[PDB]
Amino acid sequence: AYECGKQGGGALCPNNKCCSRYGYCGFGPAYCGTGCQSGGCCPGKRCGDQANGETCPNNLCCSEDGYCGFGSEYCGAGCQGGPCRADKLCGQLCPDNLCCSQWGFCGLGVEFCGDGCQSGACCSMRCGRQADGAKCTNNYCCGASGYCGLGGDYCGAGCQSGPCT
Amino acid sequence: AYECGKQGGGALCPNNKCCSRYGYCGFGPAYCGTGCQSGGCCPGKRCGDQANGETCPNNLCCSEDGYCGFGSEYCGAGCQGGPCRADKLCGQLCPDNLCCSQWGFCGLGVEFCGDGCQSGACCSMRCGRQADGAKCTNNYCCGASGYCGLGGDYCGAGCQSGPCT
Ligand SMILES: CC(=O)N[C@@H]1[C@@H](O)[C@H](O)[C@@H](CO)O[C@@H]1O
Ligand SMILES: CC(=O)N[C@@H]1[C@@H](O)[C@H](O)[C@@H](CO)O[C@@H]1O
Numbered sequence: 641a642y643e644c645g646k647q648g649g650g651a652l653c654p655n656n657k658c659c660s661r662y663g664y665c666g667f668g669p670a671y672c673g674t675g676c677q678s679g680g681c682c683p684g685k686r687c688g689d690q691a692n693g694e695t696c697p698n699n700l701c702c703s704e705d706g707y708c709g710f711g712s713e714y715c716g717a718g719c720q721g722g723p724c725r726a727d728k729l730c731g732q733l734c735p736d737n738l739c740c741s742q743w744g745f746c747g748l749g750v751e752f753c754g755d756g757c758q759s760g761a762c763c764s765m766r767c768g769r770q771a772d773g774a775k776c777t778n779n780y781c782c783g784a785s786g787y788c789g790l791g792g793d794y795c796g797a798g799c800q801s802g803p804c805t
Numbered sequence: 806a807y808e809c810g811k812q813g814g815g816a817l818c819p820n821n822k823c824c825s826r827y828g829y830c831g832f833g834p835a836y837c838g839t840g841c842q843s844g845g846c847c848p849g850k851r852c853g854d855q856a857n858g859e860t861c862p863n864n865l866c867c868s869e870d871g872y873c874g875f876g877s878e879y880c881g882a883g884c885q886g887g888p889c890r891a892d893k894l895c896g897q898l899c900p901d902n903l904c905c906s907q908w909g910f911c912g913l914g915v916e917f918c919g920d921g922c923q924s925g926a927c928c929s930m931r932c933g934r935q936a937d938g939a940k941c942t943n944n945y946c947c948g949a950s951g952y953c954g955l956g957g958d959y960c961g962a963g964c965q966s967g968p969c970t
């Protein structure tokens with residue numbers, strides 16, 4: 641019956657819906673208040689230096705104060721994670737599986753994850769016996785066909801390297 | 806069994822994991838490629854004026870070209886949805902259940918959702934008998950104890966107004 645959070649296999653709710661302490665999605669104090677696991681919690685979840693490095697769920701910004709949210713107070717000056725307004729440098733893996741572009745910035749989409757992607761959720765990174773025994777980054781699995789990724793297709797049967805099986 | 810997407814009751818994957826066309830979470834072409842439903846799809850999902858006004862899942866930015874991603878190319882100049890680097894005004898709902906602050910900016914966290922929150926995922930917006938008949942915004946439900954929210958706790962038993970079931 642569960643939808644989200646520790647009860648629901650770590651799933652997130654769509655459209656910033658809060659995951660309650662009990663593992664269901666909604667808005668209002670029952671969901672977003674005490675025990676809120678993810679989504680638009682109020683107050684925001686604790687993040688960054690103020691929670692042992694933990695990033696914000698649902699790609700929220702981590703404020704200078706170490707709360708999760710959106711707006712200039714969270715993403716602007718002093719932002720310490722999520723889609724901060726500042727460019728995010730890498731080369732230092734990108735947080736939360738963001739791609740590190742060939743030019744050393746974090747992002748998602750083909751400019752980051754496509755040609756020249758260094759690490760993170762690259763579109764098409766080759767590995768294993770199809771790529772000279774090359775390893776995957778980010779502790780991803782090498783799939784049977786010698787592509788990097790995660791999930792059963794890469795970590796399951798035929799997995800060559802990384803956290804197989 | 807299913808984790809995400811249409812098969813998984815609309816759930817998102819954590820940490821920008823792609824939801825495959827079959828409703829499981831992963832990375833690599835099988836998850837992020839053709840039929841990717843959410844997460845760090847490659848290419849990015851279509852969005853905004855190239856997708857009938859659909860917003861990006863997982864609070865990705867919608868680029869001026871109508872793709873979902875992160876980085877300056879997506880959130881910077883031309884950004885048409887998600888956590889764009891530009892401040893977002895409201896007064897005129899916010900997208901994606903973001904709170905419209907008392908000052909007329911969209912965001913999440915207490916500065917937006919707390920005291921003076923006009924609409925969206927407000928922390929504690931009063932409604933119903935306890936608020937002299939006041940209506941919720943966003944087509945939220947007014948719960949039994951007179952707060953605005955969504956989910957079973959608000960739309961279910963005791964729901965006073967909005968789309969009660
Ligand atoms: C794909 C990539 O890494 N692009 C970056 C861009 O995100 C960043 O804003 C800019 C800063 O000068 O440098 C590059 O163009
Ligand atoms: C395309 C898609 O649904 N991929 C899933 C994969 O994520 C999952 O972990 C595995 C176990 O069922 O096999 C599937 O095909």
Ligand SMILES: CC(=O)N[C@@H]1[C@@H](O)[C@H](O)[C@@H](CO)O[C@@H]1O
Pocket residue numbers: 711712713892906907908909910911912916917
């Ligand atoms: C809580 C709130 O609405 N704060 C906004 C801030 O997010 C925005 O960047 C600024 C623009 O001038 O106006 C206010 O300070």
